Scaffold this motif. Structure first.
Motif, mmCIF file in Angstrom:
data_model
loop_
_atom_site.group_PDB
_atom_site.id
_atom_site.type_symbol
_atom_site.label_atom_id
_atom_site.label_comp_id
_atom_site.label_asym_id
_atom_site.label_seq_id
_atom_site.Cartn_x
_atom_site.Cartn_y
_atom_site.Cartn_z
ATOM 1 N N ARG A 119 12.347 59.678 68.836
ATOM 2 C CA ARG A 119 11.073 60.045 68.913
ATOM 3 C C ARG A 119 10.620 61.228 67.846
ATOM 4 N N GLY A 186 16.788 46.956 85.304
ATOM 5 C CA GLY A 186 16.811 47.294 83.947
ATOM 6 C C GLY A 186 15.611 48.297 83.953
ATOM 7 N N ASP A 227 0.545 50.456 79.069
ATOM 8 C CA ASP A 227 0.857 51.250 79.897
ATOM 9 C C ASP A 227 1.145 51.200 81.435
ATOM 10 N N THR B 2 -0.465 50.401 65.066
ATOM 11 C CA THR B 2 0.449 50.079 66.182
ATOM 12 C C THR B 2 1.190 51.467 66.710
ATOM 13 N N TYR B 3 1.887 52.066 65.388
ATOM 14 C CA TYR B 3 2.322 53.337 65.671
ATOM 15 C C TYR B 3 1.377 54.542 66.570
ATOM 16 N N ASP B 5 -1.366 53.333 68.382
ATOM 17 C CA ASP B 5 -1.540 52.893 69.569
ATOM 18 C C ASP B 5 -0.375 53.220 70.655
ATOM 19 N N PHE B 6 0.694 53.220 69.815
ATOM 20 C CA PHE B 6 2.052 53.649 70.800
ATOM 21 C C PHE B 6 1.883 54.957 71.065
ATOM 22 N N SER B 9 -0.378 55.913 73.952
ATOM 23 C CA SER B 9 -0.118 55.293 75.322
ATOM 24 C C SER B 9 0.864 56.247 76.273
ATOM 25 N N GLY B 10 0.789 56.019 77.309
ATOM 26 C CA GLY B 10 1.689 56.934 78.548
ATOM 27 C C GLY B 10 3.020 56.311 78.289
ATOM 28 N N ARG B 11 3.374 55.482 77.267
ATOM 29 C CA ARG B 11 4.830 55.085 77.382
ATOM 30 C C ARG B 11 5.688 55.686 76.211
ATOM 31 N N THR B 12 5.464 56.866 75.855
ATOM 32 C CA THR B 12 6.401 57.507 74.785
ATOM 33 C C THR B 12 7.362 58.449 75.447
ATOM 34 N N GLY B 13 7.278 58.608 76.653
ATOM 35 C CA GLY B 13 8.452 59.562 77.300
ATOM 36 C C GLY B 13 9.355 58.780 77.635
ATOM 37 N N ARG B 14 10.441 59.132 78.457
ATOM 38 C CA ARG B 14 11.805 58.516 79.070
ATOM 39 C C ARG B 14 11.111 57.587 80.153
ATOM 40 N N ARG B 15 11.563 56.131 79.820
ATOM 41 C CA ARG B 15 11.201 55.098 80.684
ATOM 42 C C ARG B 15 12.417 55.169 81.411
ATOM 43 N N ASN B 16 11.888 55.324 82.956
ATOM 44 C CA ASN B 16 12.927 54.875 84.011
ATOM 45 C C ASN B 16 12.843 53.552 84.403
ATOM 46 N N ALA B 17 14.295 53.286 85.117
ATOM 47 C CA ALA B 17 14.677 51.884 85.318
ATOM 48 C C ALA B 17 13.732 51.136 86.673
ATOM 49 N N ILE B 18 13.888 50.188 87.038
ATOM 50 C CA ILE B 18 13.208 49.797 88.136
ATOM 51 C C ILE B 18 14.631 49.159 88.981
ATOM 52 N N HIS B 19 14.777 49.941 90.170
ATOM 53 C CA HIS B 19 15.800 49.514 91.263
ATOM 54 C C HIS B 19 15.310 48.320 91.727
#
Ligand SMILES: Cc1n[nH]c2ccc(-c3cncc(OC[C@@H](N)Cc4cccc(OCC5CCCCC5)c4)c3)cc12
Lengths: 336, 20
Positions: A119, A186, A227, B2-3, B5-6, B9-19
């Protein structure tokens, strides 16, 4: 390789069949700081007062594990880590539990998360991304040969050690599977198409996530983002991908086969397996044994201002550890 | 870009997994 694996398979099988239990206690460790957090646990720097060593200790709230339906997964994680071993895999040194929690003490990797470095820097150069991808490639060849699917590859789970090498962490979704598996798990951005389309899948999902990692590593951003997961899932199951302009042709190509929806056409999941990856052009300059032997020149060496340093980890709100006077989930975790 | 738009976006932080 085939000689290495066989032997390695035998140690894992030994440990896999007779997993170790209760090899330490909380009071032997000194709490120092939180370096990571999760939906059912946190990770802390810890020092072992007898040896004076620093370890990473993962505390799992047993009640949070049950509410989120991760008992089996948690039992999988511990069972696999106490039995695996590889230069690029974090080490499960000790494990135990108490009335309220499950614990996994491991080797501390002071370099911090690739996520952070990635990052901050924006993007890695192909030689830099190639250096780490190779490490993930061999690791997956290791695990896979032992019938384990990793399932949670992502910058956040990759750690940079002192010599500048990667260390895979988090095995909450790792699982020994010979044959199809169905669990939906995942992280969105890294979800293979088979997974999102609820169709049963295999190791091939670890190679799709590999291609995701590589791209994100060379571009600075993910090949499929939005998003909200659904919108990400459509992009994923779309069969379309766009590459930056600096991406070399070999790189675009390698990613094209890795990020293949047609899992009967996706690199890694073919007849020659992993070799379609390791023998791929983009990897032409890679000396695989060199990588395995940790003798290749690391593109970047994180800085350590001393033993137990943590400048490469973010700050998390500290919360005291609590251990109720009553056992909370005895039978569910009896084998831990 | 793109960089951009990235980064926007609200997706540049740590992305948690879906249990689940
Ligand atoms: C350090 C270290 N040294 N050695 C080690 C050996 C192993 C592990 C380690 C083991 N297991 C799991 C680990 O981290 C998992 C973490 N990245 C998962 C994760 C990723 C993105 C967002 C998250 O929560 C997002 C939020 C959602 C809402 C609730 C709070 C979390 C959580 C790390 C760490 C170290």
């Amino acid at each position: 390789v085939k000689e290495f694996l066989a032997k390695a398979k035998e140690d894992f099988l030994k440990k896999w069949e007779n997993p170790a239990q209760n090899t330490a206690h909380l009071d032997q460790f000194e709490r120092i700081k939180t370096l990571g957090t999760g939906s059912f646990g946190r990770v802390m720097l810890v020092k072992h007062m007898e040896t004076g060593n620093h370890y990473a200790m993962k505390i799992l709230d047993k009640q949070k594990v049950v509410k989120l339906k991760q008992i089996e997964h948690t039992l999988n994680e511990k069972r696999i880590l106490q039995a695996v071993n590889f230069p690029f895999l974090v080490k499960l040194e000790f494990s135990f539990k108490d009335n309220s929690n499950l614990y996994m003490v491991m080797e501390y990797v002071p370099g911090g998360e690739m996520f952070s470095h990635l990052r901050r820097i924006g993007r890695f150069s192909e030689p830099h991304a190639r250096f780490y991808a190779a490490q993930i490639v061999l690791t997956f060849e290791y695990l896979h040969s032992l019938d384990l699917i990793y399932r949670d590859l992502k910058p956040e789970n990759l750690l940079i050690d002192q010599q500048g090498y990667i260390q895979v962490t988090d095995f909450g979704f790792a699982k020994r599977v010979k044959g199809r598996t169905w669990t939906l798990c995942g992280t969105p951005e890294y979800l293979a198409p088979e997974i999102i389309l609820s169709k049963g899948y295999n190791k091939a999902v670890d190679w799709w996530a590999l291609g995701v990692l590589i791209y994100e590593m060379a571009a600075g951003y993910p090949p499929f983002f939005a998003d909200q997961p659904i919108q990400i899932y459509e992009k994923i199951v779309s069969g379309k991908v766009r590459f930056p302009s600096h991406f070399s042709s070999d790189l675009k190509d390698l990613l094209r086969n890795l990020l293949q929806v047609d899992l009967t056409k996706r690199f890694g999941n073919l007849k020659d397996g992993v070799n379609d990856i390791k023998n791929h052009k983009w990897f032409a300059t890679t000396d695989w044994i060199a990588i395995y032997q940790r003798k290749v020149e690391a593109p970047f060496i994180p800085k350590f201002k001393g033993p137990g340093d943590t400048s490469n980890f973010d700050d998390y709100e500290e919360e005291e550890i609590r251990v109720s006077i009553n056992e909370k989930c005895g039978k569910e975790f009896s084998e831990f | 870009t793109t960089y951009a738009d990235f980064i926007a976006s609200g997706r540049t932080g740590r992305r948690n997994a879906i249990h689940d």
